[PDB]
mmCIF file of all heavy atoms in Angstrom:
data_model
loop_
_atom_site.group_PDB
_atom_site.id
_atom_site.type_symbol
_atom_site.label_atom_id
_atom_site.label_comp_id
_atom_site.label_asym_id
_atom_site.label_seq_id
_atom_site.Cartn_x
_atom_site.Cartn_y
_atom_site.Cartn_z
ATOM 1 N N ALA A 1 -49.091 -2.031 40.062
ATOM 2 C CA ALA A 1 -49.433 -2.128 38.648
ATOM 3 C C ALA A 1 -50.886 -1.700 38.430
ATOM 4 O O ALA A 1 -51.782 -2.239 39.090
ATOM 5 C CB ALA A 1 -49.228 -3.556 38.154
ATOM 6 N N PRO A 2 -51.164 -0.749 37.531
ATOM 7 C CA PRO A 2 -52.561 -0.354 37.319
ATOM 8 C C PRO A 2 -53.380 -1.482 36.704
ATOM 9 O O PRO A 2 -52.856 -2.341 35.991
ATOM 10 C CB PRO A 2 -52.457 0.836 36.358
ATOM 11 C CG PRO A 2 -51.065 1.292 36.440
ATOM 12 C CD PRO A 2 -50.257 0.079 36.719
ATOM 13 N N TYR A 3 -54.681 -1.464 36.987
ATOM 14 C CA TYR A 3 -55.575 -2.477 36.440
ATOM 15 C C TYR A 3 -55.672 -2.285 34.937
ATOM 16 O O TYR A 3 -56.177 -1.256 34.465
ATOM 17 C CB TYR A 3 -56.956 -2.373 37.086
ATOM 18 C CG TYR A 3 -57.996 -3.244 36.427
ATOM 19 C CD1 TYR A 3 -57.886 -4.625 36.437
ATOM 20 C CD2 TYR A 3 -59.099 -2.681 35.793
ATOM 21 C CE1 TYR A 3 -58.837 -5.424 35.835
ATOM 22 C CE2 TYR A 3 -60.054 -3.473 35.189
ATOM 23 C CZ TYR A 3 -59.918 -4.848 35.211
ATOM 24 O OH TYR A 3 -60.869 -5.638 34.613
ATOM 25 N N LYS A 4 -55.187 -3.262 34.178
ATOM 26 C CA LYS A 4 -55.168 -3.210 32.721
ATOM 27 C C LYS A 4 -56.258 -4.099 32.134
ATOM 28 O O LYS A 4 -56.382 -5.268 32.515
ATOM 29 C CB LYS A 4 -53.800 -3.639 32.192
ATOM 30 C CG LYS A 4 -52.709 -2.609 32.435
ATOM 31 C CD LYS A 4 -51.318 -3.221 32.341
ATOM 32 C CE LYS A 4 -50.943 -3.964 33.614
ATOM 33 N NZ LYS A 4 -49.500 -4.316 33.645
ATOM 34 N N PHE A 5 -57.034 -3.537 31.210
ATOM 35 C CA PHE A 5 -58.099 -4.259 30.533
ATOM 36 C C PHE A 5 -58.215 -3.709 29.118
ATOM 37 O O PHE A 5 -57.834 -2.575 28.836
ATOM 38 C CB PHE A 5 -59.439 -4.151 31.276
ATOM 39 C CG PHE A 5 -59.994 -2.758 31.353
ATOM 40 C CD1 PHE A 5 -61.030 -2.368 30.527
ATOM 41 C CD2 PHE A 5 -59.491 -1.844 32.261
ATOM 42 C CE1 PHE A 5 -61.549 -1.094 30.599
ATOM 43 C CE2 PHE A 5 -60.006 -0.564 32.336
ATOM 44 C CZ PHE A 5 -61.041 -0.191 31.503
ATOM 45 N N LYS A 6 -58.748 -4.537 28.225
ATOM 46 C CA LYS A 6 -58.915 -4.181 26.821
ATOM 47 C C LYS A 6 -60.200 -3.396 26.613
ATOM 48 O O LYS A 6 -61.232 -3.708 27.217
ATOM 49 C CB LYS A 6 -58.917 -5.431 25.942
ATOM 50 C CG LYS A 6 -57.539 -6.036 25.733
ATOM 51 C CD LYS A 6 -56.724 -5.223 24.735
ATOM 52 C CE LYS A 6 -55.419 -5.920 24.387
ATOM 53 N NZ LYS A 6 -54.418 -5.803 25.482
ATOM 54 N N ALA A 7 -60.129 -2.378 25.757
ATOM 55 C CA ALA A 7 -61.256 -1.524 25.424
ATOM 56 C C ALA A 7 -61.169 -1.144 23.953
ATOM 57 O O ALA A 7 -60.100 -1.198 23.342
ATOM 58 C CB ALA A 7 -61.284 -0.268 26.302
ATOM 59 N N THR A 8 -62.313 -0.763 23.383
ATOM 60 C CA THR A 8 -62.412 -0.373 21.982
ATOM 61 C C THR A 8 -62.990 1.026 21.895
ATOM 62 O O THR A 8 -64.027 1.314 22.503
ATOM 63 C CB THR A 8 -63.285 -1.357 21.191
ATOM 64 O OG1 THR A 8 -62.912 -2.698 21.521
ATOM 65 C CG2 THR A 8 -63.125 -1.134 19.697
ATOM 66 N N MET A 9 -62.321 1.893 21.135
ATOM 67 C CA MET A 9 -62.743 3.274 20.947
ATOM 68 C C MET A 9 -63.460 3.412 19.614
ATOM 69 O O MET A 9 -63.133 2.706 18.650
ATOM 70 C CB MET A 9 -61.543 4.223 20.980
ATOM 71 C CG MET A 9 -61.188 4.736 22.373
ATOM 72 S SD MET A 9 -59.958 6.073 22.482
ATOM 73 C CE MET A 9 -59.637 6.531 20.781
ATOM 74 N N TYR A 10 -64.432 4.321 19.556
ATOM 75 C CA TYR A 10 -65.202 4.598 18.350
ATOM 76 C C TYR A 10 -65.382 6.104 18.237
ATOM 77 O O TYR A 10 -65.950 6.730 19.135
ATOM 78 C CB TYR A 10 -66.571 3.913 18.368
ATOM 79 C CG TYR A 10 -66.555 2.434 18.670
ATOM 80 C CD1 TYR A 10 -66.488 1.974 19.977
ATOM 81 C CD2 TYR A 10 -66.635 1.500 17.651
ATOM 82 C CE1 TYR A 10 -66.480 0.622 20.257
ATOM 83 C CE2 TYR A 10 -66.630 0.146 17.924
ATOM 84 C CZ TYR A 10 -66.553 -0.287 19.228
ATOM 85 O OH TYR A 10 -66.546 -1.634 19.502
ATOM 86 N N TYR A 11 -64.903 6.676 17.137
ATOM 87 C CA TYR A 11 -65.023 8.111 16.930
ATOM 88 C C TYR A 11 -64.821 8.418 15.455
ATOM 89 O O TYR A 11 -64.273 7.607 14.703
ATOM 90 C CB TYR A 11 -64.021 8.891 17.789
ATOM 91 C CG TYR A 11 -62.578 8.628 17.437
ATOM 92 C CD1 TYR A 11 -61.875 9.488 16.604
ATOM 93 C CD2 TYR A 11 -61.916 7.519 17.943
ATOM 94 C CE1 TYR A 11 -60.558 9.244 16.285
ATOM 95 C CE2 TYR A 11 -60.598 7.272 17.623
ATOM 96 C CZ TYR A 11 -59.919 8.135 16.798
ATOM 97 O OH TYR A 11 -58.609 7.895 16.482
ATOM 98 N N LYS A 12 -65.283 9.600 15.050
ATOM 99 C CA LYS A 12 -65.179 10.077 13.682
ATOM 100 C C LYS A 12 -64.367 11.363 13.672
ATOM 101 O O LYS A 12 -64.658 12.293 14.431
ATOM 102 C CB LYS A 12 -66.557 10.319 13.071
ATOM 103 C CG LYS A 12 -67.564 9.223 13.354
ATOM 104 C CD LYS A 12 -68.686 9.241 12.334
ATOM 105 C CE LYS A 12 -69.785 8.256 12.686
ATOM 106 N NZ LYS A 12 -70.879 8.279 11.685
ATOM 107 N N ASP A 13 -63.352 11.415 12.810
ATOM 108 C CA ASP A 13 -62.502 12.596 12.712
ATOM 109 C C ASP A 13 -63.128 13.648 11.813
ATOM 110 O O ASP A 13 -62.775 13.759 10.637
ATOM 111 C CB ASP A 13 -61.117 12.222 12.181
ATOM 112 C CG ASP A 13 -60.206 11.660 13.257
ATOM 113 O OD1 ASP A 13 -60.569 11.703 14.449
ATOM 114 O OD2 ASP A 13 -59.115 11.167 12.905
ATOM 115 N N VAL A 14 -64.064 14.431 12.350
ATOM 116 C CA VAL A 14 -64.708 15.480 11.575
ATOM 117 C C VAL A 14 -63.666 16.549 11.282
ATOM 118 O O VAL A 14 -63.039 17.084 12.199
ATOM 119 C CB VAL A 14 -65.911 16.065 12.333
ATOM 120 C CG1 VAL A 14 -66.524 17.215 11.549
ATOM 121 C CG2 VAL A 14 -66.955 14.984 12.599
ATOM 122 N N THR A 15 -63.475 16.858 9.995
ATOM 123 C CA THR A 15 -62.482 17.853 9.596
ATOM 124 C C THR A 15 -63.068 18.705 8.478
ATOM 125 O O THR A 15 -63.287 18.216 7.369
ATOM 126 C CB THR A 15 -61.192 17.174 9.154
ATOM 127 O OG1 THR A 15 -60.534 16.598 10.284
ATOM 128 C CG2 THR A 15 -60.258 18.174 8.482
ATOM 129 N N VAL A 16 -63.312 19.978 8.780
ATOM 130 C CA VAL A 16 -63.832 20.952 7.830
ATOM 131 C C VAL A 16 -62.751 22.006 7.650
ATOM 132 O O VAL A 16 -62.310 22.619 8.629
ATOM 133 C CB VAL A 16 -65.169 21.568 8.286
ATOM 134 C CG1 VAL A 16 -65.102 22.076 9.723
ATOM 135 C CG2 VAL A 16 -65.578 22.694 7.347
ATOM 136 N N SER A 17 -62.309 22.200 6.410
ATOM 137 C CA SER A 17 -61.245 23.140 6.091
ATOM 138 C C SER A 17 -61.740 24.231 5.155
ATOM 139 O O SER A 17 -62.564 23.976 4.273
ATOM 140 C CB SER A 17 -60.061 22.411 5.453
ATOM 141 O OG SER A 17 -60.471 21.700 4.292
ATOM 142 N N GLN A 18 -61.217 25.438 5.349
ATOM 143 C CA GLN A 18 -61.534 26.598 4.534
ATOM 144 C C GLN A 18 -60.346 26.831 3.613
ATOM 145 O O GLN A 18 -59.213 26.964 4.089
ATOM 146 C CB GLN A 18 -61.807 27.820 5.406
ATOM 147 C CG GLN A 18 -62.264 29.049 4.643
ATOM 148 C CD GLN A 18 -62.551 30.219 5.556
ATOM 149 O OE1 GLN A 18 -62.825 30.043 6.743
ATOM 150 N NE2 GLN A 18 -62.492 31.426 5.008
ATOM 151 N N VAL A 19 -60.598 26.871 2.308
ATOM 152 C CA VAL A 19 -59.553 27.050 1.310
ATOM 153 C C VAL A 19 -59.814 28.307 0.500
ATOM 154 O O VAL A 19 -60.939 28.544 0.045
ATOM 155 C CB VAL A 19 -59.461 25.821 0.380
ATOM 156 C CG1 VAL A 19 -58.359 26.013 -0.662
ATOM 157 C CG2 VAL A 19 -59.227 24.558 1.201
ATOM 158 N N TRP A 20 -58.767 29.103 0.313
ATOM 159 C CA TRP A 20 -58.807 30.325 -0.473
ATOM 160 C C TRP A 20 -58.094 30.060 -1.785
ATOM 161 O O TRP A 20 -56.913 29.704 -1.798
ATOM 162 C CB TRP A 20 -58.156 31.498 0.263
ATOM 163 C CG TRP A 20 -57.841 32.656 -0.631
ATOM 164 C CD1 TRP A 20 -56.606 33.041 -1.062
ATOM 165 C CD2 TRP A 20 -58.777 33.574 -1.213
ATOM 166 N NE1 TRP A 20 -56.712 34.145 -1.873
ATOM 167 C CE2 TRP A 20 -58.033 34.490 -1.982
ATOM 168 C CE3 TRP A 20 -60.163 33.709 -1.160
ATOM 169 C CZ2 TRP A 20 -58.635 35.531 -2.689
ATOM 170 C CZ3 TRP A 20 -60.759 34.743 -1.862
ATOM 171 C CH2 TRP A 20 -59.996 35.642 -2.613
ATOM 172 N N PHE A 21 -58.807 30.231 -2.888
ATOM 173 C CA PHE A 21 -58.285 29.988 -4.229
ATOM 174 C C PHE A 21 -57.871 31.316 -4.852
ATOM 175 O O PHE A 21 -58.711 32.156 -5.189
ATOM 176 C CB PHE A 21 -59.329 29.282 -5.069
ATOM 177 C CG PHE A 21 -59.777 27.967 -4.502
ATOM 178 C CD1 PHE A 21 -61.051 27.815 -3.992
ATOM 179 C CD2 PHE A 21 -58.923 26.880 -4.475
ATOM 180 C CE1 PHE A 21 -61.469 26.610 -3.464
ATOM 181 C CE2 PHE A 21 -59.332 25.670 -3.954
ATOM 182 C CZ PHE A 21 -60.606 25.537 -3.446
ATOM 183 N N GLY A 22 -56.563 31.497 -5.015
ATOM 184 C CA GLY A 22 -56.042 32.704 -5.616
ATOM 185 C C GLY A 22 -55.958 32.591 -7.124
ATOM 186 O O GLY A 22 -56.448 31.645 -7.741
ATOM 187 N N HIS A 23 -55.311 33.589 -7.728
ATOM 188 C CA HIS A 23 -55.161 33.589 -9.179
ATOM 189 C C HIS A 23 -54.250 32.458 -9.649
ATOM 190 O O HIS A 23 -54.463 31.902 -10.733
ATOM 191 C CB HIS A 23 -54.610 34.931 -9.653
ATOM 192 C CG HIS A 23 -54.267 34.961 -11.111
ATOM 193 N ND1 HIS A 23 -55.208 34.798 -12.102
ATOM 194 C CD2 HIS A 23 -53.077 35.134 -11.742
ATOM 195 C CE1 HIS A 23 -54.621 34.871 -13.283
ATOM 196 N NE2 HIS A 23 -53.329 35.072 -13.096
ATOM 197 N N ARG A 24 -53.234 32.111 -8.852
ATOM 198 C CA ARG A 24 -52.297 31.058 -9.217
ATOM 199 C C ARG A 24 -51.889 30.180 -8.041
ATOM 200 O O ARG A 24 -50.870 29.486 -8.138
ATOM 201 C CB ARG A 24 -51.045 31.678 -9.843
ATOM 202 C CG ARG A 24 -50.316 30.788 -10.842
ATOM 203 C CD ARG A 24 -49.193 31.468 -11.669
ATOM 204 N NE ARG A 24 -48.201 32.219 -10.897
ATOM 205 C CZ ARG A 24 -48.378 33.401 -10.318
ATOM 206 N NH1 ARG A 24 -49.441 34.151 -10.570
ATOM 207 N NH2 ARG A 24 -47.441 33.873 -9.501
ATOM 208 N N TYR A 25 -52.628 30.185 -6.934
ATOM 209 C CA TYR A 25 -52.257 29.379 -5.785
ATOM 210 C C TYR A 25 -53.484 29.094 -4.923
ATOM 211 O O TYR A 25 -54.533 29.718 -5.073
ATOM 212 C CB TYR A 25 -51.180 30.077 -4.946
ATOM 213 C CG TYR A 25 -51.643 31.389 -4.355
ATOM 214 C CD1 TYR A 25 -52.257 31.431 -3.108
ATOM 215 C CD2 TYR A 25 -51.473 32.586 -5.040
ATOM 216 C CE1 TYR A 25 -52.684 32.626 -2.561
ATOM 217 C CE2 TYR A 25 -51.900 33.787 -4.500
ATOM 218 C CZ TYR A 25 -52.502 33.804 -3.264
ATOM 219 O OH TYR A 25 -52.927 34.994 -2.723
ATOM 220 N N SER A 26 -53.317 28.134 -4.014
ATOM 221 C CA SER A 26 -54.348 27.716 -3.078
ATOM 222 C C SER A 26 -53.768 27.824 -1.678
ATOM 223 O O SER A 26 -52.574 27.585 -1.484
ATOM 224 C CB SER A 26 -54.826 26.288 -3.354
ATOM 225 O OG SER A 26 -55.868 25.919 -2.466
ATOM 226 N N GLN A 27 -54.603 28.183 -0.705
ATOM 227 C CA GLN A 27 -54.154 28.343 0.667
ATOM 228 C C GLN A 27 -55.260 27.943 1.640
ATOM 229 O O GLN A 27 -56.443 28.129 1.352
ATOM 230 C CB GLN A 27 -53.724 29.793 0.932
ATOM 231 C CG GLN A 27 -53.316 30.099 2.366
ATOM 232 C CD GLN A 27 -52.849 31.530 2.535
ATOM 233 O OE1 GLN A 27 -52.615 32.242 1.556
ATOM 234 N NE2 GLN A 27 -52.725 31.967 3.781
ATOM 235 N N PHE A 28 -54.851 27.405 2.786
ATOM 236 C CA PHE A 28 -55.787 26.991 3.827
ATOM 237 C C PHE A 28 -56.040 28.158 4.770
ATOM 238 O O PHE A 28 -55.174 28.511 5.578
ATOM 239 C CB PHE A 28 -55.243 25.801 4.604
ATOM 240 C CG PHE A 28 -55.529 24.474 3.972
ATOM 241 C CD1 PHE A 28 -54.521 23.741 3.384
ATOM 242 C CD2 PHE A 28 -56.807 23.946 3.991
ATOM 243 C CE1 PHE A 28 -54.777 22.522 2.810
ATOM 244 C CE2 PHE A 28 -57.074 22.722 3.419
ATOM 245 C CZ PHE A 28 -56.057 22.008 2.828
ATOM 246 N N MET A 29 -57.224 28.763 4.682
ATOM 247 C CA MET A 29 -57.557 29.871 5.558
ATOM 248 C C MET A 29 -57.984 29.413 6.943
ATOM 249 O O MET A 29 -58.171 30.259 7.831
ATOM 250 C CB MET A 29 -58.668 30.719 4.934
ATOM 251 C CG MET A 29 -58.226 31.514 3.715
ATOM 252 S SD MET A 29 -57.081 32.847 4.117
ATOM 253 C CE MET A 29 -56.869 33.612 2.513
ATOM 254 N N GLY A 30 -58.137 28.109 7.161
ATOM 255 C CA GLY A 30 -58.532 27.596 8.458
ATOM 256 C C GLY A 30 -58.981 26.149 8.389
ATOM 257 O O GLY A 30 -59.685 25.753 7.460
ATOM 258 N N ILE A 31 -58.575 25.351 9.377
ATOM 259 C CA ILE A 31 -58.925 23.940 9.466
ATOM 260 C C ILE A 31 -59.436 23.681 10.873
ATOM 261 O O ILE A 31 -58.795 24.079 11.853
ATOM 262 C CB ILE A 31 -57.729 23.024 9.138
ATOM 263 C CG1 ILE A 31 -57.132 23.384 7.772
ATOM 264 C CG2 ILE A 31 -58.167 21.546 9.160
ATOM 265 C CD1 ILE A 31 -55.890 22.597 7.397
ATOM 266 N N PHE A 32 -60.583 23.015 10.973
ATOM 267 C CA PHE A 32 -61.214 22.689 12.245
ATOM 268 C C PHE A 32 -61.344 21.178 12.353
ATOM 269 O O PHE A 32 -62.147 20.571 11.633
ATOM 270 C CB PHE A 32 -62.579 23.361 12.357
ATOM 271 C CG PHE A 32 -63.419 22.852 13.494
ATOM 272 C CD1 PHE A 32 -62.955 22.908 14.797
ATOM 273 C CD2 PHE A 32 -64.671 22.307 13.254
ATOM 274 C CE1 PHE A 32 -63.731 22.435 15.840
ATOM 275 C CE2 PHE A 32 -65.445 21.837 14.290
ATOM 276 C CZ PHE A 32 -64.976 21.903 15.583
ATOM 277 N N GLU A 33 -60.562 20.577 13.243
ATOM 278 C CA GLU A 33 -60.558 19.137 13.472
ATOM 279 C C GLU A 33 -61.282 18.842 14.774
ATOM 280 O O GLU A 33 -61.052 19.520 15.785
ATOM 281 C CB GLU A 33 -59.125 18.596 13.525
ATOM 282 C CG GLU A 33 -58.250 19.046 12.363
ATOM 283 C CD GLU A 33 -56.878 18.406 12.384
ATOM 284 O OE1 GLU A 33 -56.236 18.415 13.455
ATOM 285 O OE2 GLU A 33 -56.444 17.891 11.333
ATOM 286 N N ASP A 34 -62.156 17.841 14.752
ATOM 287 C CA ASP A 34 -62.922 17.465 15.933
ATOM 288 C C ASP A 34 -63.217 15.973 15.893
ATOM 289 O O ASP A 34 -63.474 15.420 14.825
ATOM 290 C CB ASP A 34 -64.230 18.260 16.007
ATOM 291 C CG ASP A 34 -64.986 18.024 17.297
ATOM 292 O OD1 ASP A 34 -64.420 17.395 18.217
ATOM 293 O OD2 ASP A 34 -66.146 18.473 17.395
ATOM 294 N N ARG A 35 -63.172 15.336 17.064
ATOM 295 C CA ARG A 35 -63.439 13.907 17.193
ATOM 296 C C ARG A 35 -64.893 13.738 17.618
ATOM 297 O O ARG A 35 -65.240 13.955 18.784
ATOM 298 C CB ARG A 35 -62.487 13.271 18.196
ATOM 299 C CG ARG A 35 -61.059 13.141 17.701
ATOM 300 C CD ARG A 35 -60.213 12.311 18.651
ATOM 301 N NE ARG A 35 -60.061 12.953 19.948
ATOM 302 C CZ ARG A 35 -59.599 12.361 21.043
ATOM 303 N NH1 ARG A 35 -59.230 11.091 21.040
ATOM 304 N NH2 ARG A 35 -59.506 13.059 22.170
ATOM 305 N N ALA A 36 -65.745 13.358 16.680
ATOM 306 C CA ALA A 36 -67.165 13.183 16.962
ATOM 307 C C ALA A 36 -67.435 11.769 17.479
ATOM 308 O O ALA A 36 -66.986 10.801 16.857
ATOM 309 C CB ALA A 36 -67.989 13.435 15.707
ATOM 310 N N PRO A 37 -68.153 11.598 18.588
ATOM 311 C CA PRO A 37 -68.424 10.244 19.073
ATOM 312 C C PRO A 37 -69.465 9.546 18.211
ATOM 313 O O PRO A 37 -70.239 10.174 17.481
ATOM 314 C CB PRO A 37 -68.944 10.471 20.494
ATOM 315 C CG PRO A 37 -69.568 11.802 20.442
ATOM 316 C CD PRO A 37 -68.731 12.613 19.492
#
């Protein structure tokens, strides 16, 4: 049995997205997700 112990994680979900606004619609030209400590 592996050694089991309790731990707490701390991180921030940095998410910057690029959106293209058309004449009658919106689209995601790119999304960058990163877990910042």
Side-chain angles (χ1 to χ4, degrees):
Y3 171 64
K4 288 161 281 192
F5 64 103
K6 284 284 187 284
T8 314
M9 271 190 6
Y10 309 82
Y11 64 97
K12 316 202 187 180
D13 279 351
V14 177
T15 290
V16 50
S17 57
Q18 185 179 337
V19 180
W20 164 253
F21 301 110
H23 173 63
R24 208 170 51 286
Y25 63 89
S26 182
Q27 176 178 348
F28 275 109
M29 290 291 184
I31 306 176
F32 168 58
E33 311 185 312
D34 187 10
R35 288 189 295 167

